[PDB]
Design a protein around this motif. Structure first.
Motif, mmCIF file in Angstrom:
data_model
loop_
_atom_site.group_PDB
_atom_site.id
_atom_site.type_symbol
_atom_site.label_atom_id
_atom_site.label_comp_id
_atom_site.label_asym_id
_atom_site.label_seq_id
_atom_site.Cartn_x
_atom_site.Cartn_y
_atom_site.Cartn_z
ATOM 1 N N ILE A 1 0.840 -1.008 -0.084
ATOM 2 C CA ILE A 1 0.066 0.054 0.023
ATOM 3 C C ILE A 1 0.986 1.250 0.103
ATOM 4 O O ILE A 1 1.685 1.490 0.828
ATOM 5 C CB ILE A 1 -1.021 0.026 1.163
ATOM 6 C CG1 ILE A 1 -1.742 -1.000 1.189
ATOM 7 C CG2 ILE A 1 -1.541 1.301 1.437
ATOM 8 C CD1 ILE A 1 -2.987 -1.304 0.058
ATOM 9 N N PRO A 2 0.887 2.131 -1.000
ATOM 10 C CA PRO A 2 1.611 3.410 -0.996
ATOM 11 C C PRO A 2 0.839 4.375 -0.324
ATOM 12 O O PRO A 2 -0.223 4.459 0.094
ATOM 13 C CB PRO A 2 1.925 3.435 -2.571
ATOM 14 C CG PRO A 2 0.638 3.143 -2.956
ATOM 15 C CD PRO A 2 -0.034 1.916 -2.326
ATOM 16 N N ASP A 3 1.825 5.534 0.074
ATOM 17 C CA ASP A 3 1.282 6.653 0.911
ATOM 18 C C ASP A 3 1.040 7.795 -0.037
ATOM 19 O O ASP A 3 0.002 8.528 0.106
ATOM 20 C CB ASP A 3 2.250 6.542 2.121
ATOM 21 C CG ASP A 3 3.520 6.986 1.609
ATOM 22 O OD1 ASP A 3 3.823 6.690 0.601
ATOM 23 O OD2 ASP A 3 4.356 7.244 2.597
ATOM 24 N N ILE B 1 -7.419 3.339 5.930
ATOM 25 C CA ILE B 1 -6.106 3.660 6.367
ATOM 26 C C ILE B 1 -6.024 5.044 6.525
ATOM 27 O O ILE B 1 -6.679 5.788 5.766
ATOM 28 C CB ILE B 1 -5.102 3.106 5.375
ATOM 29 C CG1 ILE B 1 -3.641 3.360 6.250
ATOM 30 C CG2 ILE B 1 -5.031 3.922 3.991
ATOM 31 C CD1 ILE B 1 -2.455 2.545 5.407
ATOM 32 N N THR C 1 -7.343 8.576 7.021
ATOM 33 C CA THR C 1 -8.474 8.770 6.839
ATOM 34 C C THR C 1 -9.331 8.513 5.497
ATOM 35 O O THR C 1 -10.149 9.273 5.221
ATOM 36 C CB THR C 1 -8.383 10.536 6.769
ATOM 37 O OG1 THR C 1 -7.784 11.031 5.668
ATOM 38 C CG2 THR C 1 -7.777 10.952 8.044
ATOM 39 N N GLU C 2 -8.578 7.784 4.610
ATOM 40 C CA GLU C 2 -9.161 7.404 3.531
ATOM 41 C C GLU C 2 -9.186 5.886 3.531
ATOM 42 O O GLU C 2 -8.453 4.914 3.689
ATOM 43 C CB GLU C 2 -8.129 7.562 2.181
ATOM 44 C CG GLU C 2 -6.995 7.310 2.130
ATOM 45 C CD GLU C 2 -5.845 7.256 3.207
ATOM 46 O OE1 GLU C 2 -4.741 6.828 3.307
ATOM 47 O OE2 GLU C 2 -6.225 8.265 4.165
ATOM 48 N N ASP C 3 -10.448 5.459 2.452
ATOM 49 C CA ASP C 3 -10.696 3.922 2.350
ATOM 50 C C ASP C 3 -10.266 3.545 0.961
ATOM 51 O O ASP C 3 -10.364 4.423 -0.117
ATOM 52 C CB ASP C 3 -12.250 3.930 2.381
ATOM 53 C CG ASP C 3 -12.864 4.055 3.520
ATOM 54 O OD1 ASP C 3 -12.297 4.470 4.458
ATOM 55 O OD2 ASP C 3 -14.210 3.863 3.595
ATOM 56 N N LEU C 4 -9.313 2.482 1.010
ATOM 57 C CA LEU C 4 -9.150 1.826 -0.274
ATOM 58 C C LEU C 4 -9.784 0.725 -0.510
ATOM 59 O O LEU C 4 -9.632 -0.284 0.293
ATOM 60 C CB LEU C 4 -7.582 1.553 -0.207
ATOM 61 C CG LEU C 4 -6.496 2.804 0.348
ATOM 62 C CD1 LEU C 4 -5.134 2.237 -0.018
ATOM 63 C CD2 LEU C 4 -6.894 4.115 -0.159
ATOM 64 N N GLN C 5 -10.496 0.532 -1.722
ATOM 65 C CA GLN C 5 -11.266 -0.634 -2.148
ATOM 66 C C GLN C 5 -10.335 -1.538 -2.962
ATOM 67 O O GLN C 5 -10.070 -1.479 -4.101
ATOM 68 C CB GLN C 5 -12.360 -0.253 -3.050
ATOM 69 C CG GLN C 5 -13.667 -1.315 -2.965
ATOM 70 C CD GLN C 5 -14.764 -0.921 -3.838
ATOM 71 O OE1 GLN C 5 -15.073 0.603 -3.816
ATOM 72 N NE2 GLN C 5 -15.672 -1.525 -3.833
ATOM 73 N N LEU C 6 -9.686 -2.553 -2.257
ATOM 74 C CA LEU C 6 -8.887 -3.363 -2.782
ATOM 75 C C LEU C 6 -9.481 -4.386 -3.669
ATOM 76 O O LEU C 6 -8.993 -4.812 -4.765
ATOM 77 C CB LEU C 6 -8.124 -4.072 -1.473
ATOM 78 C CG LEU C 6 -7.322 -3.261 -0.694
ATOM 79 C CD1 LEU C 6 -6.693 -4.310 0.545
ATOM 80 C CD2 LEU C 6 -6.047 -2.703 -1.166
ATOM 81 N N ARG C 7 -10.637 -4.813 -3.227
ATOM 82 C CA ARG C 7 -11.717 -5.675 -4.075
ATOM 83 C C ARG C 7 -13.113 -5.313 -3.750
ATOM 84 O O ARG C 7 -13.271 -5.343 -2.375
ATOM 85 C CB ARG C 7 -11.118 -7.030 -3.976
ATOM 86 C CG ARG C 7 -11.610 -7.904 -5.196
ATOM 87 C CD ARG C 7 -11.237 -9.176 -4.916
ATOM 88 N NE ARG C 7 -9.826 -9.545 -5.548
ATOM 89 C CZ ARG C 7 -9.696 -10.220 -6.577
ATOM 90 N NH1 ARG C 7 -10.685 -10.960 -7.398
ATOM 91 N NH2 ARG C 7 -8.483 -10.251 -7.038
ATOM 92 N N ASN C 8 -13.996 -5.249 -4.542
ATOM 93 C CA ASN C 8 -15.424 -5.028 -4.341
ATOM 94 C C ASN C 8 -15.936 -6.561 -4.129
ATOM 95 O O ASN C 8 -17.304 -6.559 -3.875
ATOM 96 C CB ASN C 8 -16.088 -4.354 -5.522
ATOM 97 C CG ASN C 8 -15.929 -5.121 -6.672
ATOM 98 O OD1 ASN C 8 -15.474 -6.291 -6.929
ATOM 99 N ND2 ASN C 8 -16.531 -4.416 -7.902
#
Lengths: 270, 270, 270, 270
Positions: free
Chosen positions: D53-55, D187, D189-196
């Motif tokens: 996961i990049p920042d 992570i 303050t933001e949501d990362l949708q790795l897979r739906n």
């Protein structure tokens, strides 16, 4: 441009077999002043300082700020840092300067009639070398061209300050913008209060060191003095040894008592 | 006194075969603070700076001034530099500190009942070494004795500032006097305007960094951080090379963006 | 055809003494897209990926699938992968493109009136070279000819998806068919569930990356950026050493976080 | 601990003059699984993958995710990745395994009666070497100790999923937490949708590959096969040359058809 100083093009018109410009070592860096530190100290009575703003990652944004050389004992026009077009001739003593420097100052302040008069009066020097006026005029014009035009800059909460600023020549406006740091700088989305108080003012007579702050700076280009003449004037001195003067406290880091130019607010766009 | 720090007498009560005080190298100089730079940074959140006033002959009078370590993002009690007797226990977190430091803080703020309670509760440590309280009490008393009393010092134009100052303990009053420099200093027969604006304030809760000036100082005793823990927080960064960041301007002399403590006026008698 | 890219025929109309097409090295392979990876990335915001289906003996059947370059922060038309004939002019910014690319896009989307208008307006370029329009028109026509028509392909369980697909031009239909892989592929007598979830959608405005999946792909043709301009925007960073960031876990095989285009079902006849 | 695999302590009880554990090279890295890739593949039918996961600054946070080795043709208990305490004995075939592995599995699933029974039945091996049970028990206990306990982890929107998760042993819970990646990761303050979409499920029988996704992975520890025996079974093959099979499309970057374990959501505190 190897030399960005506007006064670097001034040369002895009569004979220039081997002449070196008095510009300092900072004349070769494009800091936006277009005036070297030596010439700025000589004419506008200020030096250059660097101000670093950190971000949070480890990168620093650098800015130039003017350091005032005016002492708290100066009065009247002696406190004027950058004269305006209304009184630049009297403040800078143009009648005492040489024709080349006078022409450069006329071109800086946009006095077309004076420019033409000086150019026509300087033609008799063509009999020495054929570039007495041509190369000087071209160099000064190409230096002034670089100064021509969501970041914003305000120089006071009063309307008269803005009116005083907008009537100045473009070169003078650029010099004031580059040499005067904002009291509060809005960068990105946050405000940095560099100083809650101002040290300089802009009026109809230009940029002045209005605040009579104590100055303990030693100029590095204006330190000459004639030791042969006898000077008789009262001063104050301290009596005591290192215990009375607390010389040991000198081991701590010294706080420099200088007067950087702070005025207005600045907005830096993303 | 080889060590003038009031906290230098704090030692592990249980066992002290080989213990070294955490006082910095400046604890051996009698600058009048009676608190070393390490302990001042740890408790009162400030560092020491030297201010030199010239006379005209070549002699410099030296003074100490506090450098605030409080950032502009601090809020509430985080902006309190030196707490007063009304809230020193909460600000300094006395309940978390050790009994020796707690006793020293009680003696500094003149809490006789707390002093007696701590002294009577610390008697059970006499079974380890017979100087758990005696030498600590004696050293703290002899340090506090040095702080007991036409130069004048005013800490504001309002009466409430004077009332807040005169209700502080003698040690706290001496520390504030030594760490806060005057905005204008009347020396001999002339006034020196060190600063036209104030950076600190004195109120019923003590000495506070009321002005939210931008601070870019790096503490030299409070730089520790746990790299093992993961920290996730948004910050701002600059994109660009040396041309965009104007890194070349770093060659000039840097103007330090710090917050020295300036407040009130001072009169130095002949 | 040595170059199968439909945009490979675009040349400077004024003068082409030595001009090289910007098509990538994949423009010489007949993968059925008829658009090179560079041009697909530039216009339709996608890259090419290979999908291999094994049989059981040791032979692999290969297919092309589009890899979306749209980030999860894109909004509105920024999420449109392939625009439809209703909004292709606005999405692709045809008014900003050159006349040759504009004519190619008009011919792709079957706009006869625009084709004739551009062809008649481009006649004045015949005075430079006599093949400004003739060779470009012929090459684009022969490229489009190859796209003209028991395998089946469904692009959703809803009727509106089929209606949106069947109203697209033949070139756009072929591009969507070649770039979008089926969620479930019925090959021979068995079904292979490549993915139980979809990543793209087909609507009246064309093929869009409807799902806001996280994209961590680095484009290999769109990585240019102006370092001279200063960019000020907040981002998030991680604090910690290799232990906190778990850098050692990088020794394992990395799972690529990308967004291939998966939608509908496909039936491959024997 | 040089070897973090819980099964690394299993040794031949009868005679161990020169024995090498079958743990892979990843058994020496503390990735939190406490099971080497070889043993995970052998027992729980999964491999290890790294997810980065990049920042925004250039730092990557690394996580482990399980790669399912279960094919789409598997049925019933063959689709169980990690068995629960209700059916671990049947799924793992404990009666067929050796006494040391059986004891390790009993200790992992917290079966005290089975632990005591195996320990008392294994005493007769003390006549060969005096550390048949002592060192194995100590190593397994010290491995299990590391698994004992604002980040949050949810494994489904239904209550029954949480009930199934919380009844598992601590070692099994830690293994499932480390091997199953979240569908959406919040992570900072933001949501990362790795897979739906999800690929695995947690039920009363443990962690299962409920979704019958197509798997084209080649295990690197389970590839053995007896070539001496004759196998007669129908399969499907492709007829055609490189033109029919589109072998040229193999030059593009291949999209791997594998089944990483994705389920639930994860909250990472600052």
């Amino acid at each position: 441009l190897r030399n960005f100083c506007v006064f670097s093009s001034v040369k002895p018109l009569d004979f220039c077999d081997q002449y070196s410009s008095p510009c300092s070592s900072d004349a070769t860096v494009d800091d936006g002043w277009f005036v070297c530190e030596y010439h700025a100290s000589r004419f506008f009575k200020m030096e250059k300082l660097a101000l670093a703003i950190p971000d949070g990652t480890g990168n620093n944004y650098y800015r130039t700020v003017g350091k005032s050389l005016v002492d708290d004992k100066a009065e009247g026009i002696e406190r004027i840092l950058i004269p305006s077009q209304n009184n630049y001739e009297t403040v800078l003593n143009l009648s005492l300067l040489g024709p080349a420097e006078r022409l450069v100052f006329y071109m800086i302040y946009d006095n077309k009639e004076k420019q033409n008069e000086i150019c026509q009066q300087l033609r008799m020097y063509e009999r020495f070398r054929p570039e007495v006026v041509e190369e000087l005029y071209n160099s000064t014009l190409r230096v002034l061209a670089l100064t021509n035009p969501n970041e914003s800059r305000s120089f006071g909460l009063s309307v008269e300050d803005d009116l005083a600023f907008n009537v100045l020549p473009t070169f003078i406006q650029n010099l004031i913008r580059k040499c005067v740091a904002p009291e509060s700088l809005t960068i990105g989305t946050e405000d940095l209060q560099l100083r809650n108080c101002n040290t300089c003012r802009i009026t109809s007579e230009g940029l002045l060191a209005s605040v009579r702050l104590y100055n303990s700076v030693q100029p590095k280009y204006l330190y000459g003095v004639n030791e042969n003449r006898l000077q008789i004037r009262n001063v104050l001195q301290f009596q005591g040894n290192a215990n009375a003067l607390q010389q040991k406290l000198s081991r701590y880091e010294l706080y420099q008592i200088n007067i950087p130019l702070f005025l207005g607010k600045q907005i830096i766009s993303t």
